[PDB]
Amino acid sequence: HHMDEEYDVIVLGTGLTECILSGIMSVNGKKVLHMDRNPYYGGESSSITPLEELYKRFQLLEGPPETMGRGRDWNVDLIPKFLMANGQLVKMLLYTEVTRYLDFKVVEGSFVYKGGKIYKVPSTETEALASNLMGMFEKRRFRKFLVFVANFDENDPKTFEGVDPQNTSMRDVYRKFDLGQDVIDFTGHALALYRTDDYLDQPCLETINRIKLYSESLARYGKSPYLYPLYGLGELPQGFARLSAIYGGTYMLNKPVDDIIMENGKVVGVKSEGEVARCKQLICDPSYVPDRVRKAGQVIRIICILSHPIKNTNDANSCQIIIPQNQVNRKSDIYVCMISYAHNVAAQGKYIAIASTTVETTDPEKEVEPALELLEPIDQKFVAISDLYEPIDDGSESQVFCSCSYDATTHFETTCNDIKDIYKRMAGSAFDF
Ligand SMILES: C/C=C(\C)CC/C=C(\C)CC/C=C(\C)CCC=C(C)C
């Protein structure tokens, strides 16, 4: 196999982040070379099919029992994550036009864990007044809070109600409406989607806007604010590969990167199969540049096949479940996202619940018991522990732009920030929406 002599950009790995940036570059008029050492797409975030392959990958010789249904009807994302309907990730996908090859379907339910139980996340005043997460009085205070958020307008100080969006902290905003720890817990982690409570002592603007984003997405799609493509996220690598051909430049799989040639601290090309191709910029995931990354931790994901909808979700065919750390004596949230035959990722009557979190103990599996208890009985489990990496070089000089490994969250918030960041580092300016 052979490469060209020169490309403006060379991308290594076909993970979601690489694919999306690769799409932007191509659409922006650059000659792109995109390759992957693997014989499949998505790298770490690959989708597995048929079911038999999933069993193989997890060392389950027995193979799936007939009761698992038609193997070919299974498309299992190793790292499933949902997209915020009105989010920027979706907007970036529209920009590349890869959306032309995707069928987004709204996730049926969104829940939050509390006191050992899961409740519907209340985003509307109506949902608030009917929520069992709070008592009669507090839920009414929360209702007024949502009112303020809904009516809030960044450019109209009359709606600020005396708060300084650029200076008044969210903690102060919470006090203003007299909201307790439990309400703050699900609002911050299940509505604003933060991973930690650092936002409490930061300007309220961002948080208010995040809650607005959730509400607006929900209002637009009805069931929840989350989207997931039919057939799983594996449809993205395929879409971008197809988009790639359009602008000339087909994705090359099963192609080894023998070396990343650096000249005076700056990349100038890549060598593969006794051949060299020059490039001005290089995009890749951590696995291609061990010396330009540091380990930021470990994540554990447990894929659980079920034959029944998750209890207490009103038989949702798909759902997001956030388990705030404070609710389970942890320093990191636990997540559970589930998709099923409704999104064409599993055989009829089957559901795929994937529980995840950041490792904090020597018994990672035990750490996720709080989430598994919400899923039993479980037909089969698939446990995977992954090391997380983040670049120690922003490519400013090297012109080598590495992405971060995918964290435990079950939505694209943090992945979107990485993409936007990497892009800014490459273009010199922020992606203009
Ligand atoms: C006010 C500045 C804005 C809105 C910047 C964002 C620019 C966009 C959304 C379009 C400019 C790009 C083109 C005219 C051509 C590239 C082709 C595609 C993105 C299909």
- Residue for token digits 């309220």? 204
Ligand 1 touching residue 429 (CB < 6 A)? no
What is the residue type of 15?
G
Q: Which of 357, 372, 388 is the last residue of a domain?
A: 388
Residues in the chain: 433
Ligand 1 touching residue 102 (CB < 6 A)? no
Euclidean distance between CA atoms 351 and 341, whole angstroms: 7
CA 119-385-422 angle, to 5 degrees, is: 85
Residues 292 and 395 in one domain: yes
Strands 6-12 and 32-35: parallel
- Residue for token digits 């447990």? 302
Residues 319 and 303 in one domain: yes
CATH number at residue 189: 1.10.405.10
Residue 221: which of 85, 395, 319 has the closest Cα?
Answer: 85
The secondary structure of 182-233, three-state, reads HHHHHHHHHHCCCCCCHHHHCEHHHHHHHHHHHHHHHHHHCCCCEEEECCCC
Q: Judge contact between 271 and 255, C-beta under 8 A.
A: no
Task: Please spell the DSSP secondary structure of 3-25, one letter per residue.
Answer: --SEEEEEEE--SHHHHHHHHHH
CA of 148 to the centre of ligand 1 (A): 34
Residues 290 and 314 in one domain: no
Residues 372 and 328 in one domain: yes
Distances (CA, A) of 202 to 168, 172, 260, 404: 8, 10, 41, 24
Domain count, the chain: 3
Report the sign of the C-alpha dihedral through residues 372, 373, 375, 380, in that order.
Answer: positive
Residues 221 and 125 in one domain: yes
CA of 84 to the centre of ligand 1 (A): 22
Residues 82 and 129 in one domain: no
Residue 328: which of 377, 361, 376 has the closest Cα?
Answer: 361
- Range of the structural domain that residue 94 is part of: 60-120+297-388
Contacting residues for 432 by C-beta, under 8 A, at least 6 apart: none
Residue 233: which of 42, 38, 93 has the closest Cα?
Answer: 42
Strands 6-12 and 276-284: parallel
Strands 293-306 and 380-391: antiparallel
Contacting residues for 270 by C-beta, under 8 A, at least 6 apart: 10, 12, 33, 257, 259, 260, 261, 276, 277, 279, 282
Technique employed here was X-ray
Ligand 1 touching residue 427 (CB < 6 A)? no
Residue 164 token pair: 């300084």
Ligand 1 touching residue 97 (CB < 6 A)? yes
Residue 411: which of 346, 337, 357, 352 has the closest Cα?
Answer: 337
3-state secondary structure of 260: strand
Residue 301: which of 368, 388, 370, 233 has the closest Cα?
Answer: 368
Residues 279 and 321 in one domain: no
What is the residue type of 198?
D
Residues 196 and 279 in one domain: no
CATH number at residue 373: 3.30.519.10
Task: Please spell the DSSP secondary structure of 344-412, one letter per residue.
Answer: TSS-TT-EEEEEEEE--SS-HHHHTHHHHTTT-S-SEEEEEEEEEEEES--STTT-EEEPPPP-S-SBS
